[PDB]
Amino acid sequence: MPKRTDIKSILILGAGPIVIGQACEFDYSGAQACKALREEGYRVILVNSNPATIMTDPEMADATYIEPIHWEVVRKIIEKERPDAVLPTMGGQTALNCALELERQGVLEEFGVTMIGATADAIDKAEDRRRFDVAMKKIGLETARSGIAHTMEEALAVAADVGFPCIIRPSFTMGGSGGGIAYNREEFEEICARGLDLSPTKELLIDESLIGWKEYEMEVVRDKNDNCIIVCSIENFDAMGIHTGDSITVAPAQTLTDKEYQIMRNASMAVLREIGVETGGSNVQFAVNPKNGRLIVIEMNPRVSRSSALASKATGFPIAKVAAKLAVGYTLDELMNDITGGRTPASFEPSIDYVVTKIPRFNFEKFAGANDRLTTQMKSVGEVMAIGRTQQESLQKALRGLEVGATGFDPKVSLDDPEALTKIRRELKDAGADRIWYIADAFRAGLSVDGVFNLTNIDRWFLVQIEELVRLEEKVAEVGITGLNADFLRQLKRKGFADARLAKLAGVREAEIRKLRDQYDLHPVYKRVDTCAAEFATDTAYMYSTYEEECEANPSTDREKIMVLGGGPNRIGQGIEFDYCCVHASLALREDGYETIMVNCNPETVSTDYDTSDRLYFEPVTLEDVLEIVRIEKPKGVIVQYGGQTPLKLARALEAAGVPVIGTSPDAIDRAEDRERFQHAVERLKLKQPANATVTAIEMAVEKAKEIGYPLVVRPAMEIVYDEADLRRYFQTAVLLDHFLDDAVEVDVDAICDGEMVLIGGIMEHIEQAGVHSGDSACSLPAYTLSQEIQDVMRQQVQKLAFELQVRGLMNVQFAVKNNEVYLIEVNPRAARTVPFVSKATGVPLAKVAARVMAGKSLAEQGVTKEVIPPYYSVKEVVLPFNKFPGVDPLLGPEMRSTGEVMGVGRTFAEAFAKAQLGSNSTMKKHGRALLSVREGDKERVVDLAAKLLKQGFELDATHGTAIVLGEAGINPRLVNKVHEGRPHIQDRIKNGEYTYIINTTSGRRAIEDSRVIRRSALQYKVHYDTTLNGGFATAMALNADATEKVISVQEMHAQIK
Amino acid sequence: IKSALLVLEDGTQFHGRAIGATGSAVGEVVFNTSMTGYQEILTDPSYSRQIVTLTYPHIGNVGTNDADEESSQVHAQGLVIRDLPLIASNFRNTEDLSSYLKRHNIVAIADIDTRKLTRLLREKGAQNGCIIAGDNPDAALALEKARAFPGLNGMDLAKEVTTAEAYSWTQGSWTLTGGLPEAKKEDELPFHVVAYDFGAKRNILRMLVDRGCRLTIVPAQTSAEDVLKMNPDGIFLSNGPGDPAPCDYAITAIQKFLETDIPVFGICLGHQLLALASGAKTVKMKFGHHGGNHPVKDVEKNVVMITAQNHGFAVDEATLPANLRVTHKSLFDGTLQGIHRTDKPAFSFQGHPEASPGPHDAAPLFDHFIELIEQYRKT
């Protein structure tokens, strides 16, 4: 009943780097568990290769391991820490998979580690598709007609049987990883091959189609006493056929009768009971035939999920915290309900008086050749959540908070476009990321609700709602600003229309509508989240805006408040790193005594956990929404430097409107971001910058370009042009011109300025040269090749820049080093994504220090004045999403595409890199055959690389010109035919498993598009490949180390620092 | 524009829109937290003389259907919601909510800050109110009628909704596949239970039938004597509106059954009655329990169940007679939820084991009743 006693120490398996399908939700859940167990007096040990997590903050646990999440490594951690138990349900699939390997490998037995929260058998039962299907039938639940496959032959016969289209779902995967919809045999073999390989258990489940049925999810929690609750129900907006993660979803369910809801609720519990989950939460998914209520069980995930985070935010019920406590013997009736002031137990079912909407965030513009249609395999990179008293209100708020430039239902097609109906139709029929907007366009274009239903299968209940909004917009357009009387305006506000949307319709400025509202005294009220529909009072201030009567904000008159703006949904480039800073500003200042107010709407993050701050406004991070909060809170200062681009773009307007922005001024920010202003400042300071121009016309560029000199960095998307002919060529398909610094070292510098002194947070040398986005590069702290003399030069320029730009808090400077010469790439006057890594590496909580500085406490005052250079190497490596978009050429360049990163800690650079590499899920082997295929300018260093590989025991293969070069150097590799050459070819060789390693460096649009097959195949076949020679050398070095040899805790790392 | 207004005893006004019949409604105002089940709730006799407020903003999403009716009519005095959906969207819907309200002649209002309303009732306790829907709702007048409301304290509503004449029920529960089943044939039902109708929910009866009971519905005021004469295998005391307190007739009768060995089971109002007849005391709650997420612990087994609640009055645990052991308590407020006679085959439950709407968690309470019955027959 109470906490377990035969347990003292617990190892928690973290999730690893963020990837599509397995994101921030796990740092939130991992952190909640740490917090929960720690609170309960347990000794916590956790492993997470992801450094940008709050869960890995040294102060959150007793033994933090930022090491590659590999069973052998985890083994060394267990062997060394000797945990009593292991909790594997808080780190997504990575954790489940790892807990089971550890089990398989007999490691658990070996050290007497007990699996808590869920058992290995339970896990498999749910994870193994065959087993799950068998269990449903045992409990009389219905499942779609399906069949198991372990081979292509087998899969083909299941298909033969279910027909097309059919649904493919690998065992031991999630986020639809390795699955899809097969509309034909061709599509069918592709998907199946992919999933069989991806499947940890090499097993697929092939189902007949239920595409178009309603999709539902239920979040359940069960205790050892067999108590069972439904924490939240979710009705998907997008029907079956589009993965829950790529779907718009709402809470609670909307279109089920109580009778249907009970059956579903009963089933849910039954499923947990049967699978064997006895001490935790689980998600149960279903399909409902709208026509007859026919219920079908889809799956169940024996752990916390992206849905559970969304569900916790939606209800106020901290699922993971609760589950962690149950994992140790606690029972629901024993736990208190957090937000109701502990006045009620956790053993209840939440009731909410509002509607919660989640909208996924995509990034298709970053993957040109990719299939941008929504399917069963997740493609979204993040999500936003909104709360409203109504669904209309809830949806529009989410729209406006998505960070894609929408103000709501902005149009996608022209009214007077002859082909509009045709485009709309297509977008409806075959859902893309923009469907929601196209739905509105459809109604504007004259399509009925039934016509839209038929194409999309989205419940009419939602559709009519959207139609009404359009109808309202049309009136707005007709009556214009004059028609905006108080009554109407208020009606509009109640339906969640944004001031910006209304302004566009009315043909006015957004500020005019806002003025109008001030006139009428038309401001929103704040309601609180309380898990019980106001049946009980709450001491927590978790709020959302709505246009109602009674306000529950009740702001303090008491303390000095500090507002922190979040980044909204995560996207590529604006990830968890920015949220980690936000969280630290709040934790620091709150600890310092301020009243900390957080503004964010990302359901996945720790920022949006009621625990992180004093006050939480779960709102779109927009000018309108923020001004409203400010209006009533009257904060002392607002921090806009920590949430990424989002809050940054708002800074000027905020200030203009009178907000008390703290830290680096909006002007100061603009100075840095405006390429013009900047070029003057560099100029002003007598610093080095690549030669640049601002070309209007084609023929203007060709000239200017002659001036500047090739190669060239065309910045509107970014490309790198090599010759005059290349210029036009671009121009065709196609402005700042910048001399591309060939063969240069890229460097990142993170620092803090308090107007008195500059503190160097860290100097990071990337492995990949300048040209490969800093965000997609591996990097070293400290530098691994850069001379001290040159670093010293960079440190000085940082200082000069800091003062000149008037920095107040964090800053980041990017340089390129070419021929012993320092060049400036750019200055980012705010917190950068590298900040968390640097903090981890150095032991200094930069985000916390800079927050204090912004708030008014100097570096000297805080006693952080000296740059820290750790005793070990810290290496950062990224994870790229190419395996989610096969059509895409998995090659690096000037634009950032990675989703996450890992950290490797070693005594040498080689050891650090090794750990980082393995941490990144690299398939690198220490033996085999390598394939070398390098470009001209690389043909010279390759030789040494070849020798190095040779020294390791690898055999070499190479293409023509490469082989020529090696031959002249005395290295005779085995010749290999390019595809057009004959046979066999690389493609063949790669596909046949010949290679364990590939090094392919290319240069020139044509050379690239040509060599696309090598990279594509390497990825498909899971061969480790390097697209940079520099990267190749690092890989080479790492062969000399053993990532499993030794493990160290963050606490230990930090203790070695002097 | 079709106005509607709701005024509370304290003078608090809520202006919104009319969604039901034109007219006025006066009753005790209560809030219900049920996210689903609005129809079953509306048709619950226990809601007689009560103005129902639902916390879930969107009420009417699934329309209405005959199967979802707990009684022959709408007992709710009035309906207060935040938003009436544009459409009903469910395969089972046969009529939209607004149409339904109108047809049942119910005064209903939408578009009001239900949250504010809810927090007020929780904070300050139940209040009487009045809703006026028409061309020019008169606030003063509304206040007048609210203020003038007698109040549910000491009000015997059971006699008001009870059946005129006795009758037999032999119908079972609905199924997704088969809908509401055809009434069973008497020879098909093993036991014969006598049910006092204090404003009985059809699901209670149906679920009894599911257990093999053939019923005989009797008016509230039926005499123990008249009853005993029937040779019941068991006696059941149904749910109902108003104060249980003033129902002397029932109390008296129950007392009479308690002298026998016949099994007795009361649900909700029938729980209160049982208690009263055993020498216990009932009180009027601050705002009461209305929702379907209510945790109730079976102190005996130390297990929790999520239940369907709907009560304004409760039995004082502190005044319980020694022959009255406690079987269940609320996890929300600690209030008395179940009791069993130490010396007799009689027990009761404050919540609604029959749910409808609501979690099925408490269904097994019926099971015990059967046991008692089967064992009573053995003897």
Ligand SMILES: Nc1ncnc2c1ncn2[C@@H]1O[C@H](COP(=O)(O)OP(=O)(O)O)[C@@H](O)[C@H]1O
């Ligand atoms: N038989 C089916 N027909 C159509 N769509 C289906 C079918 N089965 C599942 N899906 C879709 O595929 C998605 C992913 O399947 P799921 O079992 O949840 O896999 P994962 O574990 O990757 O989340 C569902 O959310 C749903 O939209």
Ligand SMILES: Nc1ncnc2c1ncn2[C@@H]1O[C@H](COP(=O)(O)OP(=O)(O)O)[C@@H](O)[C@H]1O
């Ligand atoms: N002149 C240049 N020469 C070489 N590489 C450059 C040059 N300008 C930019 N890059 C490359 O392009 C990347 C992105 O450029 P940047 O100005 O930093 O844009 P962003 O705001 O996205 O960070 C850099 O990280 C770097 O690798």
Ligand SMILES: CC[N+](CC)(CC)CC
């Ligand atoms: C979900 C993330 N992985 C599967 C568990 C692949 C990137 C971890 C290796």
Ligand SMILES: NCCC[C@H](N)C(=O)O
């Ligand atoms: N740090 C970027 C990932 C490196 C990848 N192996 C490639 O070389 O493209």
Ligand SMILES: [Cl-]
């Ligand atoms: Cl996976």
Ligand SMILES: [Cl-]
């Ligand atoms: Cl069907």
Ligand SMILES: [Cl-]
């Ligand atoms: Cl347009």
Ligand SMILES: [Cl-]
């Ligand atoms: Cl108007």
Ligand SMILES: [Cl-]
């Ligand atoms: Cl693709």
Ligand SMILES: [Cl-]
């Ligand atoms: Cl109101």
Ligand SMILES: [K+]
């Ligand atoms: K153990």
Ligand SMILES: [K+]
């Ligand atoms: K599963």
Ligand SMILES: [K+]
């Ligand atoms: K089946």
Ligand SMILES: [K+]
């Ligand atoms: K879906």
Ligand SMILES: [K+]
């Ligand atoms: K997100």
Ligand SMILES: [K+]
């Ligand atoms: K780089």
